[PDB]
Amino acid sequence: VSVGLPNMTQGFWENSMLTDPGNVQKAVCHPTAWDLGKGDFRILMCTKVTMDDFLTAHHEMGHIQYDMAYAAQPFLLRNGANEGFHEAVGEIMSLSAATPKHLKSIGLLSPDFQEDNETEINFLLKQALTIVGTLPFTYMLEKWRWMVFKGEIPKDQWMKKWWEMKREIVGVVEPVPHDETYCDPASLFHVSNDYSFI
Amino acid sequence: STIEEQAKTFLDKFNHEAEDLFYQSSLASWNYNTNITEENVQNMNNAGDKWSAFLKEQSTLAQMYPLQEIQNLTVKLQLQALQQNGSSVLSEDKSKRLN
Amino acid sequence: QCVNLITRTQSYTNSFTRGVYYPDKVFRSSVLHSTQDLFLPFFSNVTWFHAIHKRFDNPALPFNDGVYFASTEKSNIIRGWIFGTTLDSKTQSLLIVNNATNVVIKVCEFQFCNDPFLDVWMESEFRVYSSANNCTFEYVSQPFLMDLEGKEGNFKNLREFVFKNIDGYFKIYSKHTPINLERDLPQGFSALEPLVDLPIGINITRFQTLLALHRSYLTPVDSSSGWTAGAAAYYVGYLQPRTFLLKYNENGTITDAVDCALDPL
Amino acid sequence: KPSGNYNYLYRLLRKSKLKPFERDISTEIYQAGNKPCNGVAGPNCYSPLQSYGFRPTYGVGHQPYRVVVLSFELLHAPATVCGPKKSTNLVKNKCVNFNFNGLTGTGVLTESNKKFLPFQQFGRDIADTTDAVRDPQTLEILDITP
């Protein structure tokens, strides 16, 4: 509401169980959203006292805010413009909550602490380790998957092909060579269940 | 009584019935994620199978509608997302091999 | 169901003195004052429609600007009162039933018989039938007539009513006079009392009355056989707008009325 | 209903534009066009009735609300429906203004002397001046004087 998004249903908060479910009933602890449909949403996690719990909570509220935004649109149109938009708009609300002036305004951070140039440089380096570090890896995975699924490159030319443009495209060399039967870039989680990288 | 009004009422009834089925399936999946039971597994499994059969039926019934006879962008987009092929040319043996 | 309905008679007589009612809700003591309104003329010509009853009669008796109704009866055979304009389930129509339990008053359209009848009885009851029910109204009250079988070795009493339609405020006035004279209307003076006013708003043109006599006990074996062509004495008079002078008592009554257009005296 | 209340139907499409206070109760399968309905048909038979669902978990805009709509009417007829009025206590032997009924009066009140008749409300003299009133609630006769 400091940003400008209005408040929403008061029955949602009791409808979402947030602390540890315990052994009384089996439940997962992955922070997940539930856009059930006609005016009903849930969140699910086990909340602990971590800063990353606050980040994931902001991510979940960004997701559910974007969910209830297009409720007036029909069920076929009750999504984002494409698949990556929803994750992106969750991520920007996730990252924008880590601003210490907001924490000082809301009292999360005491006013005695101050922000310097070197601390900001370290924070930017961590952000580069998280955001721009994964970008060229996602690029070469997407390119290799696109040549694979296009059916253009030969299947048996992969003696060192993925190895060699791992060496020249992103600057990572394998420690041990592998034979033709290996499909290690195709052995990842997303390719194994056909989850795209674009 | 042009084809646009028939497409409109078909889209509306599909939206309502698919909304009900999606609501039931998402509710069952949510309370199963909070409380893991085999009866809940059967619940949203039957709901998802019925919703998959329903979406196949709606796509096949929407195959009659001409996608080039719609000038509204929203109805054209929703029919395009409804007239998807999926298994237009697919042998059952090939489908089960893929699965 | 409906029954034999081709029977008509006629008679003719006069009317001496009756037909004076209170003007409205007002009271005075020993004051002689005048009004100009509807009244039954003194010594006026009336129409004795039918003489005496186990007889059938089917008249089409019209209505115009109020009506004076009079009848003698023991055990109260007369039960039904029907007013209206079309009387064929076309416009709203009056219906008064004066059964010994409670009087029922209902105005709406009705598809009754052209010549309606009510009864056939004992064991079970023959109630109202042969009508349409596409209409809504209600009223119920204590029945107008006094207790049945009010007969002795001599004559007992005579019933009289007047009806007036004005401004959608249908008014009925009545009296039960206990007389021992045994010959038509009695030579004497009395008044008429206001009892019921109904806000309705329906024009009336034709009206009739109903008898609720059991034609038989068993339905198919016995019914009506060789008893028709007649009905009871229920003298009918009309009304004209004229002037009257009335006399009031010390308690407040009406004990003398003199016409204002009869003779030079 | 916790499993969903589907008994609350509503008609999505009517034959023509609605008339003020017009009711559609028939279960006719609404033939939209381009093909006759012919009993039951797939593409163009199109039953227009739709359920409400109505679970207690539904949203604020989706929860079952109950609504009563009221319409009065006036006509050139006696008015059969009105609003009640509460009357204060009545006093005697004081020069007061009063409204015992639709008539409006003013004067000193005194107890009864002359008996009335039950179908009577107004006592008058020979000069058209009202001087006797029966009380509405209590059946007591009162006499007014200027």
mmCIF file of C-alpha atoms in Angstrom, chain D residues 66-70:
data_model
loop_
_atom_site.group_PDB
_atom_site.id
_atom_site.type_symbol
_atom_site.label_atom_id
_atom_site.label_comp_id
_atom_site.label_asym_id
_atom_site.label_seq_id
_atom_site.Cartn_x
_atom_site.Cartn_y
_atom_site.Cartn_z
ATOM 1 C CA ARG D 66 -30.000 -12.125 -0.137
ATOM 2 C CA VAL D 67 -31.886 -9.164 -1.592
ATOM 3 C CA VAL D 68 -35.445 -7.918 -1.072
ATOM 4 C CA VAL D 69 -36.733 -5.424 -3.646
ATOM 5 C CA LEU D 70 -39.914 -3.528 -2.772
#
